[PDB]
Amino acid sequence: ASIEVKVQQLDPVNGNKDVGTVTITESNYGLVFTPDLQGLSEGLHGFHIHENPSCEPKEQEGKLTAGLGAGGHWDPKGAKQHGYPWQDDAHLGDLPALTVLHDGTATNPVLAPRLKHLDDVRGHSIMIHTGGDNHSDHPAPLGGGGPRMACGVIK
Template sequence: MKKISLLILGILISTTSCKKVKKETEETTEEVKEVVEEVKSDESKKIKVTLEPKSNSNVKGSVVFTETNGTVKMVAVFEGLSEGEHAIHLHEKADCSADDATSSGGHWNPTFKDHGKWGVESGYHKGDIGNFTADANGNGTLTFSTDEWCIGCGDETKDILGKAVIVHQGADDFTSQPSGAAGARVSCGGVIQ
């Protein structure tokens, strides 16, 4: 009888112990899942866009967009430009099929603001990036960051997918409506994934 009682006691302890281990394992698994989800939400998204010459220019380049923790960083490198200042904008459509890139539409302006300088209180288009300078060899670079854009988030007031990057012949004056009087579109690339 003593052996049977000990055996039953052993089974009960074992069952209780297994249930406790199973519960702890489930809790740990849930914690790991939560951490993995947090890591996934902080992962970087990256898109590289190649720009081709337009309007009988030789301007080409590349732009890399990287989104990390809710901020999109844009790094652009160009060659074949005339020396001086050039405007760069995001346009409505990732369509560079026209010889003069007019197929890309106007500046991307999902919030229906007037054209202006980025960050100015009076307003600006979400595509109004600004100007950059090309050196005597025709090379230019630009780095730009904002939390007002996203890559593939589906928010039509922030999502840059389906837009075009346009480089203009001249500088943006930040006041002329609706485009800043920046001249011909000399290079175009579509932001697609």
């Protein structure tokens, strides 16, 4: 029971770059996401499972935008609302925020209690945003994650 996801920093122009991996394992309380990332900006970053198994950029109003190919937050139960990892009426893809230390590394594992089986995340993508995550659609949509900084396709 384990999936090692290769994660890359997104740059539609200069090119993407490997920043490490995120290993997903099953615990008695839900899926555990264990990062081993580097070269990221210090702080808390929005961390979610997105609908499409793609990290490719997509054209948006005449602008090749990073990670748009991944689609929106994975929401199989139609919550149509961004929320907490422990909130039942929030996107099923809403994970705890990722902590990146001063040295640009992330190794602190986080639990997603609503995700129970590894197979459930296969066929999707995992996204790391430039901004944080206040687990609400206010004052900013999707927790204020904003732009997509890094991404990995979940095989």
